[PDB]
Design an enzyme around this catalytic site. Structure first.
Site, PDB file in Angstrom:
ATOM      1  CG  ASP B  89     -35.212 -17.545 -32.742  1.00 14.40           C
ATOM      2  OD1 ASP B  89     -33.739 -17.464 -32.712  1.00 14.40           O
ATOM      3  OD2 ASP B  89     -35.455 -18.196 -33.483  1.00 14.40           O
ATOM      4  CE  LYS B  91     -31.641 -17.929 -35.405  1.00 10.22           C
ATOM      5  NZ  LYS B  91     -31.720 -19.006 -36.616  1.00 10.22           N
ATOM      6  CG  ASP B  94     -23.355  -5.550 -35.453  1.00 12.07           C
ATOM      7  OD1 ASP B  94     -22.140  -5.154 -35.598  1.00 12.07           O
ATOM      8  OD2 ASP B  94     -24.283  -5.072 -36.503  1.00 12.07           O
TER       9      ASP B  94
HETATM   10  O1  LIG Z   1     -32.870 -20.065 -32.865  1.00  6.63           O
HETATM   11  C1  LIG Z   1     -33.723 -20.576 -33.722  1.00  6.63           C
HETATM   12  O2  LIG Z   1     -35.010 -20.818 -32.889  1.00  6.63           O
HETATM   13  C2  LIG Z   1     -33.514 -21.378 -34.956  1.00  6.63           C
HETATM   14  C3  LIG Z   1     -32.412 -21.974 -35.275  1.00  6.63           C
HETATM   15  C4  LIG Z   1     -32.090 -22.677 -36.330  1.00  6.63           C
HETATM   16  O3  LIG Z   1     -31.225 -23.445 -36.231  1.00  6.63           O
HETATM   17  N1  LIG Z   1     -33.262 -23.031 -36.859  1.00  6.63           N
HETATM   18  C5  LIG Z   1     -34.469 -22.504 -36.853  1.00  6.63           C
HETATM   19  O4  LIG Z   1     -35.355 -22.744 -37.636  1.00  6.63           O
HETATM   20  N2  LIG Z   1     -34.697 -21.712 -35.930  1.00  6.63           N
HETATM   21  C6  LIG Z   1     -36.066 -20.860 -35.343  1.00  6.63           C
HETATM   22  O5  LIG Z   1     -37.004 -21.962 -35.184  1.00  6.63           O
HETATM   23  C7  LIG Z   1     -38.064 -21.860 -35.843  1.00  6.63           C
HETATM   24  C8  LIG Z   1     -38.470 -22.958 -36.877  1.00  6.63           C
HETATM   25  O6  LIG Z   1     -39.699 -22.793 -37.204  1.00  6.63           O
HETATM   26  P1  LIG Z   1     -40.330 -24.039 -37.931  1.00  6.63           P
HETATM   27  O7  LIG Z   1     -39.419 -24.471 -38.999  1.00  6.63           O
HETATM   28  O8  LIG Z   1     -41.537 -23.775 -38.534  1.00  6.63           O
HETATM   29  O9  LIG Z   1     -40.791 -25.242 -37.127  1.00  6.63           O
HETATM   30  C9  LIG Z   1     -37.945 -20.391 -36.723  1.00  6.63           C
HETATM   31  O10 LIG Z   1     -38.809 -19.312 -36.238  1.00  6.63           O
HETATM   32  C10 LIG Z   1     -36.709 -20.122 -36.778  1.00  6.63           C
HETATM   33  O11 LIG Z   1     -36.193 -18.787 -36.882  1.00  6.63           O
HETATM   34  O1  LIG Z   2     -17.378  -6.525 -39.048  1.00 10.32           O
HETATM   35  C1  LIG Z   2     -18.312  -5.540 -38.774  1.00 10.32           C
HETATM   36  C2  LIG Z   2     -19.407  -5.605 -39.461  1.00 10.32           C
HETATM   37  C3  LIG Z   2     -20.274  -4.674 -39.109  1.00 10.32           C
HETATM   38  N1  LIG Z   2     -19.886  -3.270 -38.350  1.00 10.32           N
HETATM   39  C4  LIG Z   2     -20.813  -2.423 -37.750  1.00 10.32           C
HETATM   40  O2  LIG Z   2     -20.079  -1.151 -38.494  1.00 10.32           O
HETATM   41  C5  LIG Z   2     -19.987  -0.048 -37.498  1.00 10.32           C
HETATM   42  C6  LIG Z   2     -18.539   0.263 -37.115  1.00 10.32           C
HETATM   43  O3  LIG Z   2     -18.559   1.399 -36.095  1.00 10.32           O
HETATM   44  P1  LIG Z   2     -17.324   2.127 -35.594  1.00 10.32           P
HETATM   45  O4  LIG Z   2     -16.749   2.642 -36.590  1.00 10.32           O
HETATM   46  O5  LIG Z   2     -18.251   3.183 -34.637  1.00 10.32           O
HETATM   47  O6  LIG Z   2     -16.691   1.097 -34.700  1.00 10.32           O
HETATM   48  C7  LIG Z   2     -21.256  -0.502 -36.443  1.00 10.32           C
HETATM   49  O7  LIG Z   2     -22.424   0.067 -36.898  1.00 10.32           O
HETATM   50  C8  LIG Z   2     -21.093  -2.082 -36.541  1.00 10.32           C
HETATM   51  O8  LIG Z   2     -22.277  -2.624 -36.024  1.00 10.32           O
HETATM   52  C9  LIG Z   2     -18.582  -3.483 -37.697  1.00 10.32           C
HETATM   53  O9  LIG Z   2     -18.178  -2.830 -36.910  1.00 10.32           O
HETATM   54  N2  LIG Z   2     -17.886  -4.767 -38.077  1.00 10.32           N
END
Ligand SMILES: O=C(O)c1cc(=O)[nH]c(=O)n1[C@@H]1O[C@H](COP(=O)(O)O)[C@@H](O)[C@H]1O
Ligand SMILES: O=c1ccn([C@@H]2O[C@H](COP(=O)(O)O)[C@@H](O)[C@H]2O)c(=O)[nH]1
Lengths: 256, 256
Positions: B89, B91, B94
């Site tokens: 997870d 997420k 970037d």
């Molecule tokens: O992607 C996820 O799983 C996530 C999305 C979201 O909307 N909310 C959310 O709580 N999570 C993850 O799901 C788990 C929820 O955990 P509990 O609140 O303890 O049941 C956590 O590890 C969060 O990081």
């Molecule tokens: O809007 C955003 C936020 C972060 N970044 C970060 O900044 C860096 C951009 O690198 P660059 O100049 O090589 O394109 C890179 O580490 C990205 O993860 C963006 O490029 N845009």
């Protein structure tokens, strides 16, 4: 409009923002190096050589093949020597209870060495409340991602306004923004802008570039974040100096 | 409406989704354990004991204090033994060029062991394109975060619709959603819902809970993701069985 040095003294300034604004003024740099490398030795050699040219070094600790906490200790030595902040571009983006753990713990212990981190605002203000529980006691700051440089970004209109409100309501910890422009009218907040190169173009995965003159001078941002425009150049020191001089003059010319 | 077993055979099904749907049907489980622990030993003891009760184990590798790649080898052994998917997870959120490195490389080498990862859609489709350039060759799948369980979530209305479009346009790699509800009408896509507990409530940092009957039965999701409702209980096996039976019966009763 106030100079960086005067903004460092504003009543509501965060201590991390103040430290940054003071060294920007002292060193005549509003350049953040995006140190997007996979080797600790290259990270540290860039930090040492480019340290005098930069106000900030931005990391992605999770792409460093040979990360250790000792590497971070050596980076802090260079940050203190050359006077720049360390910004881990972790883009925290989970529920508050999870991000507090991701910030303090695990193998990276980000809060132990990063002056600044950033967060997406999409989960709501719990992301900031979770981070601030670790970051406030450790005297750290946070940037909120109000706008993004990439093609198809949904960080526009009401989303950007929500990021500004969330920052302005958490000013004990949030010190500014990742943005393409000035998004807050409050001078206490920092604006840092990635997607910067001297030449027009982009990459093959949605990155879009604008020039230092455009984002500092016309769009009113404070700091340019530059990765490949420096890192891929043969002479990274001369490239850093080109970007520093561009961003600094754009700032001076907006000041008058 | 089709059973999980029939959805596993749909013409446009992704192989990772098919493997998951087949083991959900075989084991009568649509429970994903959120293994939100800091010790490798506790992670592995939970994976072994709860493996028969779960279709999936969700990790946050970056909160493990004693992460090594050998811990992940041991987790894969248990995933193969008990038949469940591993979902990191992370997420990703970037630009495409950065997330490809965060997925393949660094200390964690997430793509080497995670069947599934997830991504926020806020940066635009480059985030998916970057991930898929590592994940497609490694036969992996991705979930897009269409809705979020936390108070103040901005993943609503047009944002949720953008996540569904991005998924349906990248179906070679995107196998479904993190959502609070059914968001896609295409049965090839998985819906996984966190923010689940048997009792009403929340946490102190913006988490909100709904019951398995509400999210599977009324809101039409496929899988419940449960952390503290299991992890904080004394008998985590009995807690997992209560969540499994709740989610499974809610699924059967919506099937009719
Ligand atoms: O992607 C996820 O799983 C996530 C999305 C979201 O909307 N909310 C959310 O709580 N999570 C993850 O799901 C788990 C929820 O955990 P509990 O609140 O303890 O049941 C956590 O590890 C969060 O990081
Ligand atoms: O809007 C955003 C936020 C972060 N970044 C970060 O900044 C860096 C951009 O690198 P660059 O100049 O090589 O394109 C890179 O580490 C990205 O993860 C963006 O490029 N845009």
């Amino acid at each position: 409009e106030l100079s960086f040095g005067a903004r460092a003294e504003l009543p509501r300034i965060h201590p991390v923002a103040s430290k940054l604004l003071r060294l920007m003024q002292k060193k005549e740099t509003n350049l953040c190096l995006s140190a997007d490398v996979s080797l600790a030795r290259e990270l540290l050699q860039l930090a040492d050589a480019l340290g005098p040219s930069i106000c900030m070094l931005k990391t992605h600790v999770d792409i460093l093949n040979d990360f250790t906490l000792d590497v971070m200790k050596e980076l802090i030595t260079l940050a203190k020597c050359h006077e720049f902040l360390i910004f881990e571009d972790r883009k925290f983006a989970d529920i508050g209870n999870t991000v507090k753990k991701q910030y303090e713990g695990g193998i990276f212990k980000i809060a132990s060495w990063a002056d600044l981190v950033n967060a997406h605002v999409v989960p709501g203000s719990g992301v900031v409340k979770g981070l601030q529980e670790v970051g406030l006691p450790l005297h750290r700051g946070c940037l909120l991602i109000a706008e993004m440089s990439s093609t198809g970004s949904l960080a526009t209109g009401d989303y950007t306004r929500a990021a500004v409100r969330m920052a302005e309501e958490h000013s004990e910890f949030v010190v500014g923004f990742i943005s393409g422009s000035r998004v807050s009218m409050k001078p206490e907040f920092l604006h840092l802008t990635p997607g910067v190169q001297l030449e027009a173009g982009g990459d093959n995965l949605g990155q879009q570039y604008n020039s230092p003159q455009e984002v500092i001078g016309k769009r009113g941002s404070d700091i340019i974040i530059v990765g490949r425009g420096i890192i891929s150049a043969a002479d990274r020191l001369e490239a850093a100096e080109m970007y520093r001089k561009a961003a600094w003059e754009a700032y001076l010319s907006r000041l008058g």
